[PDB]
């Protein structure tokens, strides 16, 4: 194992995560075009290929994402093996129904489920496929996710893209530019960060 | 409380546990669309050996049920799936809805709506509850336990997202029939083709078309002459003329 919240607030277009070396798990809750947002660009051109050799990635999408994400995904290196999704509900259980040019409310949201080359030792078939879990402030997922990747894959490090303060974990490297500052522990992370950024600078390259 | 935690510690799904899963309006609304439905018509018909286009007219909507092997582990892959000629009997104003299962068909299918040339607009879960049977359900990709279905629906041209019922019984292959609900109840049009269907699905309002159907009773000249003037572009949802 366990591994205190680490954290980096930034423009993710920006950052070199070369730096931060090799993840078992990505979680990523982009900002998609449908504060700020990610163009599909910035989105296709994102450095998500350096963070993993083998593992899983888990992109949140809704709407026209669950099309664009996939393509990400895809272009990333990776195979879409599973689809989670998460059952919004409200504090008695009973769903919410929630967008113009749809005629059929919406209950979920969707969570894919990438997998880059061959992962080893990774507990799969523990958790299912749907969350149930009580929907809080607008686009806060919930912290059921942290639980089934941990299960997953224990005591491994992991790194969320476009996280807020709330998202933090044991075990997790957080990136967002909500974030408060540079809170870094692990040594070797902290020597290649200063080393890149002797300022503590990450200015647009 | 954590229901991916207590599913794991008891077998029990997180859908097990979501509650309670205008009247006058949606009464009246099922009563007009049962009121304009055409009689039902269907097909026994090989769709890898028929040709598609002897269907007639133009469907507004269509229900692709394709038998993959992941429903009973002639199964369809979806090589055969992507080559059927959906666009060839789909009206340039029209639906699609496609039951792609819970693995690769969740993409495979996405490529199929397009290539027929729809946008997807709707994905449509079937979550199964085992209330009845808790415990555990592996294919060999897979993260999670899949408990979960998909049907996407497309659109072509110019309720809520969640069915929830309980797992079927080994061997039934059937599909909630809530997805007809949905469908009907958007008022897309009277021509609906169903693709793939049997007896156990046939239905007013539709023409069921495949391999396992013991009877036929369809006609081209006869089904066109249910939609001829005045009554081409009904809804299904309204009084008819
Ligand atoms: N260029 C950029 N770099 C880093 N973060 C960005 C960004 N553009 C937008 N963001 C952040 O991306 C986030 C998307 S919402 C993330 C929600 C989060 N997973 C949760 O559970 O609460 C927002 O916090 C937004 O501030
Ligand atoms: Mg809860």
């Given at each position: 194992r366990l591994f205190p919240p680490q954290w980096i607030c930034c423009d993710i277009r920006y950052?070199?995560?070369?730096?931060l070396g090799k993840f078992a798990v990505v979680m990523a809750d982009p900002p998609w075009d449908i504060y700020g947002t990610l163009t599909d660009d910035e989105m296709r051109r994102l450095?998500?290929?350096?963070?993993?050799?083998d593992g899983f990635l888990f992109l949140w999408v809704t709407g026209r994402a669950m099309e664009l994400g996939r393509e990400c995904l895809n272009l990333w290196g990776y195979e879409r093996v599973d689809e989670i999704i998460w059952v919004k509900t409200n504090q008695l259980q009973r769903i919410i129904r929630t967008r113009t040019g749809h005629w059929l409310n919406h209950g979920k949201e969707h969570c894919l489920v990438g997998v880059k080359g061959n992962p080893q030792g990774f507990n799969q078939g523990?958790?299912?496929?749907?969350i149930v879990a009580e929907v809080r402030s607008?686009?806060?997922?919930?912290?059921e996710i942290y639980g089934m990747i941990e299960r997953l894959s224990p005591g491994t490090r992991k790194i969320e893209l476009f996280?807020?303060?709330?998202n933090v974990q044991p075990n997790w490297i957080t990136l967002g530019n909500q974030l408060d500052g540079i809170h870094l522990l692990d040594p070797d992370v902290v020597a290649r960060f200063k080393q890149k950024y002797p300022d503590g600078i990450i200015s647009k390259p | 409380n954590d229901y991916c935690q207590h599913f794991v510690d008891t077998?029990?799904?997180?859908?097990?546990?979501?509650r309670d899963v205008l009247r006058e309006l949606i009464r009246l609304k099922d009563e007009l669309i049962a009121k304009s439905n055409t009689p039902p018509m269907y097909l026994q018909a090989d769709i890898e050996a028929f040709?598609?286009?002897?269907?007639?007219?133009?469907?507004?909507v269509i229900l692709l049920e394709p038998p993959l092997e992941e429903y009973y582990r002639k199964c369809w892959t979806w090589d055969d799936i992507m080559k059927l000629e959906i666009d060839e009997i789909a009206a340039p104003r029209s639906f699609i809805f496609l039951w792609?299962?819970?693995?690769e068909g969740l993409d495979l299918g996405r490529v199929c709506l397009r290539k027929w040339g729809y946008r997807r607009c709707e994905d449509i879960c079937w979550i199964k509850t085992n209330k009845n049977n808790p415990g555990k359900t592996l294919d060999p990709k897979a993260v999670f336990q899949r408990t979960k279905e998909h049907c996407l629906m497309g659109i072509k041209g110019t309720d809520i997202d969640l069915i929830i019922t309980e797992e079927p019984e080994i061997g039934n292959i059937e599909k909630p029939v809530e997805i007809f609900h949905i469908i009907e109840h958007f008022?897309?049009?009277?021509?609906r083709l169903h693709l793939f269907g049997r007896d156990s699905t046939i239905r007013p309002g539709w023409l069921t078309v495949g391999p396992?159907?013991?009877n036929s009773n369809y006609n081209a000249e006869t089904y066109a002459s249910y939609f001829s003037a005045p009554n081409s572009?009904?809804?299904?949802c309204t009084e008819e003329i």
């Open positions: 950052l070199d995560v070369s730096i450095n998500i290929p350096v963070l993993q050799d523990l958790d299912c496929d749907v607008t686009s806060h997922k919930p912290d996280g807020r303060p709330h | 077998g029990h799904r997180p859908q097990n546990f979501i040709d598609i286009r002897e269907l007639t007219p133009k469907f507004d792609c299962g819970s693995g008022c897309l049009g009277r021509r396992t159907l013991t572009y009904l809804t299904g």
